Ligand binder design. Sequence first.
Ligand code: NAD
Ligand code: NAD
Ligand code: NAD
Ligand code: NAD
Lengths: 303, 303, 303, 303
Amino acid sequence: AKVGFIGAGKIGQTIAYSALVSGAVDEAVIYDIIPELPDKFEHELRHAFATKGIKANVLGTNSLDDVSGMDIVVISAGKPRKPGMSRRDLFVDNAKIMIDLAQKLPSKNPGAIYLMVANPVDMMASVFMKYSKQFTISAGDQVETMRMRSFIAKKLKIPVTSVDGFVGGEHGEDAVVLWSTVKIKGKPVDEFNINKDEVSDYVKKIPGEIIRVIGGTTWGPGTIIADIIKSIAFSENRVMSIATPKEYEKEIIHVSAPTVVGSSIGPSLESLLDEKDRWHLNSAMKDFYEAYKENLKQLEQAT
Amino acid sequence: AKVGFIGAGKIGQTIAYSALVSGAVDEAVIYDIIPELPDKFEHELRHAFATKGIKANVLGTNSLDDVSGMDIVVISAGKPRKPGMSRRDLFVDNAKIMIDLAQKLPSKNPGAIYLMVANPVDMMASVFMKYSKQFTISAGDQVETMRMRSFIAKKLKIPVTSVDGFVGGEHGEDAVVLWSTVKIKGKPVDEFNINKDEVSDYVKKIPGEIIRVIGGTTWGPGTIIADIIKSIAFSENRVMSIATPKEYEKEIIHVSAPTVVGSSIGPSLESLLDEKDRWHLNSAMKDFYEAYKENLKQLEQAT
Amino acid sequence: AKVGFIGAGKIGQTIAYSALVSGAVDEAVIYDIIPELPDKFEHELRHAFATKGIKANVLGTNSLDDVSGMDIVVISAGKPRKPGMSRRDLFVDNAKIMIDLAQKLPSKNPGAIYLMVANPVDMMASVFMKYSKQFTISAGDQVETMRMRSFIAKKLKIPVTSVDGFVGGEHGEDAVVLWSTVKIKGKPVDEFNINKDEVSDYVKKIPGEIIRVIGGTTWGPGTIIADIIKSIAFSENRVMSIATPKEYEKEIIHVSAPTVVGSSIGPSLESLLDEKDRWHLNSAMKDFYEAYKENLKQLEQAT
Amino acid sequence: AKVGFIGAGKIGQTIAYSALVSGAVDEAVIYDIIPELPDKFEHELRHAFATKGIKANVLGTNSLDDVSGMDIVVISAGKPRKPGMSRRDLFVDNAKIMIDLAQKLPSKNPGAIYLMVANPVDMMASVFMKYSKQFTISAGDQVETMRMRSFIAKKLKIPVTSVDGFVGGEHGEDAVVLWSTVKIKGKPVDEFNINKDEVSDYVKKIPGEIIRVIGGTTWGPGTIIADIIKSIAFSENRVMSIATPKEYEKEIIHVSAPTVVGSSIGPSLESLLDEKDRWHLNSAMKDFYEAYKENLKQLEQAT
Ligand SMILES: NC(=O)c1ccc[n+]([C@@H]2O[C@H](COP(=O)([O-])OP(=O)(O)OC[C@H]3O[C@@H](n4cnc5c(N)ncnc54)[C@H](O)[C@@H]3O)[C@@H](O)[C@H]2O)c1
Ligand SMILES: NC(=O)c1ccc[n+]([C@@H]2O[C@H](COP(=O)([O-])OP(=O)(O)OC[C@H]3O[C@@H](n4cnc5c(N)ncnc54)[C@H](O)[C@@H]3O)[C@@H](O)[C@H]2O)c1
Ligand SMILES: NC(=O)c1ccc[n+]([C@@H]2O[C@H](COP(=O)([O-])OP(=O)(O)OC[C@H]3O[C@@H](n4cnc5c(N)ncnc54)[C@H](O)[C@@H]3O)[C@@H](O)[C@H]2O)c1
Ligand SMILES: NC(=O)c1ccc[n+]([C@@H]2O[C@H](COP(=O)([O-])OP(=O)(O)OC[C@H]3O[C@@H](n4cnc5c(N)ncnc54)[C@H](O)[C@@H]3O)[C@@H](O)[C@H]2O)c1
């Protein structure tokens, strides 16, 4: 696929690098508002490519117009979290970015899939889609999903490959582990020595903890989001707990649920969850819709 | 994963080779009735591994008791089709193989996923599961699925990665394209100039044509079935049109539908298809049922 | 790289499949004299590609004029060995193939690297280069090299990645282990309990044993030769004991020594071997020379 | 291989991640003096591994004693460059680190290969080896080597895979392009529209420029150094322009030259360079020896 990267900070570089070395990206165009940053990143990539024999076309640029004719456009441009902040605290800052980008990108990338990475991720995806009128998805709870699998595997001292399942609903701190999907070698997680609250808590806290020590999350979400790109680019049909757009009281919202990710996106698999999980996903919709409306008014308090 | 390969003929060797070089198999045990065959294949694999730096343990054996402790057991032991034959002609001869394997493998590989390759594939899976009571899947129409995708791509002169969709129902000559799933860059196949009947006919005829010219199918189903193994081994959650066990009229039958394939298998997604494709999948259940009951009688009439 | 495959039998198909799934081949054109064979192999490859997201162009053809513009041309067209035969028995029959290919391929593929696989491999490379004057290499003793490594590893019950070293000189039954290059975790092989003669004998006999049981060698040399292709295609600079053209007594001959393989081929490293291994490589030149002159006379005595 | 990482800053993380995802590292132990940093990096890795199905054992730790029984030990612990500094300016700061590590690591990792990454790289490798008495190599001019190939490919608008060759001698700013190795599709670089001084200059300046804009080099040298790890771990025998130890006036020094990198290291290929290149490598030895002796005295001016 041809993939545009809007944002070449820590997470944008990690995602682009990981997606490029995985072989899923035939051509990439990497943009950033910071002078020379994308350009120097391009050189980094070429140097890396030489050792691997990678021939992917890469352009690092400060010119937004170079992001044209892409299949997928990955948006990580935004303020990141500082210790002590919630993700939703960023709404007003980063929504202005999305509003601006929504004016500019569409005419150059008609029919592209837009992949939101910038936080608060689900909200950003809704804002971007509202303004751009372009099909937009959010990395959503796919990162949470993998964090959950890896914690459970570490806890039982089993390979992560023995664990299956997803995290879903609202993003981050408000996500829910979808326990009816969670299986260990095919068996319900109940059959195991697993404290469900300890799993949820690790998932919600570990990014905050990475931020406090390292300064931001990189390798994990970078790899994970790149795999979303790869599933689209190779048409692999991986079920991923991304957030796809839904209509709710005539407003576009984004909420996560296991979703088939291929050259085409969908369907989402919420209808196949157990009752409790389906109730949590309905709930997540109502809560998201309420918090997002509030946030839109508070932004409308521009003047 | 630890993977058992039962049957080391053309397709068995291809699946094993491809699953091993893909990185999805940590240990493999390969069995065949043919004296020394498994041994010499093992030496072939070792030679290949040396150039790749692959360290997977591999044992080729003529003693079936050496296949123990597997996570996945792949069965390709059986007589293949000859130009002229139908897949289902093989039922009696190959059912006898499955009944015997079902009395030997499970005690050594309890709780393994059993992946049926030998034809008639779906019926063999049903027999094996009947005589073993171990969880058994069939390659099903996943091969057809890929043939369909590839045909549409070469026809429209587009990358295969632009095409999404599945083939399902009964296996082989009785399969149906699930047209409500076939999309080109997200758009319904009707918006393109492809003749649905030409697609079907290609899918149905190409294996018979390859069998006529080359003598048997290898690289295609081998790679495609190795990817089923990989999706289980790495818990990738790819939607694949494999055939999983379904309770119908109190019998266990196998029919293909798009199904989540990870360390855990399922759910199948037939409830998300359109009315027409759900009708077709319901008829396939009925038809498979009637034909399997008939075939079972034929088997009794041998023994 | 753009890669031409001349001969789509057992080994040709294996090399091509393995080189294509490794990512080293951007475009491939596969030729065989057998009507429809290349075509049906192409369809096999396309089916495999769909599951992997591989977009390499591939053309199977019965018209040799379709092989043009290649960077590398791989020749496996020829009669194979039967239980009992020696590799060199094939000289006359296969030399006739090479003389013809040499009058047809170069005009269409000027400046390509020609990689000889058909046996007797080294002698075929010398003939092809004689009649084509195009730069021609032979798989040489790279296959032997890997067999030797793998044997030592299984013997000492160590990972194959712990073993380094090469097999060189004449090909096959006349090859010699270059013992000054064989190291286990950096240490000379003498410090371990391996019998040098048992290693040699294994290396010499295993292909004949595989040919006896299975009918021909495939996965091992196929993977190993595909890695020669990859090392050229990605300019990896792997030292491989291939046979490159050497001017001796004003003839061009082919003998194996560890050689740098990248987008450019060479140098060969025989001047860095110990006295004994340099002696052996000098005798192989003399012996190959005398035997090739004899074989050329035999060819004249056919035509 | 089992690989220890001493240092989990920007370059240590990039190298470890790249080496891990490439599949060359079976077990890694990552240490850093910064509290909690390695630990949080380990979590990042596990999260990334979950999406890929990677089962490599990883331990991120603040306890140096955990770095035991490794095959390879990769040392990136040290002060990095700030704009305006040369690499050799760091000698006195980072040599103290190496002296300390030389007391501590050996008894826990007997017979390991130590891979120096921290600057001034060649000097650091000599210091570490002097004090530890352990076999030590330096990433050397391998990074420069790839930078050169990629620049030339960009300049001629050809794939980097068409370019072959190496940079060698002293490190960084004092490196020399070894023009007799440099080939484009097999042809001498003279046959091409290439300004040699412009190539050298780009190579020497581009890291300084990345540092000024981004803050440090990451992806390129990370990938490149990881490929050195991979060549050792898979015993691939890639020729790489690393710096291996040589004796000079009874002192151990490190200088770069194309070197065969496998489970065993060596031989270096300086003897096969043209005259001019060989003279530059002799020269580099004399100059290195002089600057390193000076630096050792200036450090001995501890008191
Ligand atoms: N799982 C996830 O979804 C996930 C993971 C990691 C980070 N993030 C989020 O991604 C965003 C970026 O994080 P980061 O660590 O890379 O931050 P960072 O500060 O390293 O980078 C942000 C980048 O965005 C750029 N930027 C800001 N405004 C821009 C504009 N108008 N146009 C173009 N570029 C612009 C900056 O120049 C900078 O290079 C943050 O919102 C962070 O919270 C999300
Ligand atoms: N897409 C698919 O599902 C697919 C693709 C290719 C082949 N097949 C089927 O796979 C089967 C094998 O095809 P093939 O081309 O490899 O045939 P083959 O003759 O090359 O190999 C069959 C192997 O099974 C062995 N065998 C027979 N009975 C056995 C037993 N009781 N235990 C162990 N091994 C036994 C034979 O010894 C032989 O080595 C056939 O039924 C064929 O129709 C299915
Ligand atoms: N390590 C090695 O170097 C190695 C390994 C395996 C096989 N081989 C050699 O490779 C050759 C092929 O072995 P195989 O097992 O694939 O034999 P095979 O009979 O399976 O295949 C040979 C193919 O070459 C074709 N052929 C014959 N003449 C031709 C021509 N003029 N143009 C195009 N195609 C032509 C045949 O039609 C057939 O499809 C043999 O000489 C064998 O000894 C070498
Ligand atoms: N091609 C190359 O060889 C290459 C490429 C990039 C960077 N580097 C060099 O590598 C070194 C590290 O660079 P970076 O960008 O990762 O710097 P950085 O500041 O991001 O990280 C340096 C790390 O070393 C750690 N450290 C310092 N002293 C230590 C000790 N005594 N024990 C353990 N850990 C210690 C720090 O805690 C820090 O995390 C520098 O010398 C830099 O110049 C070399």
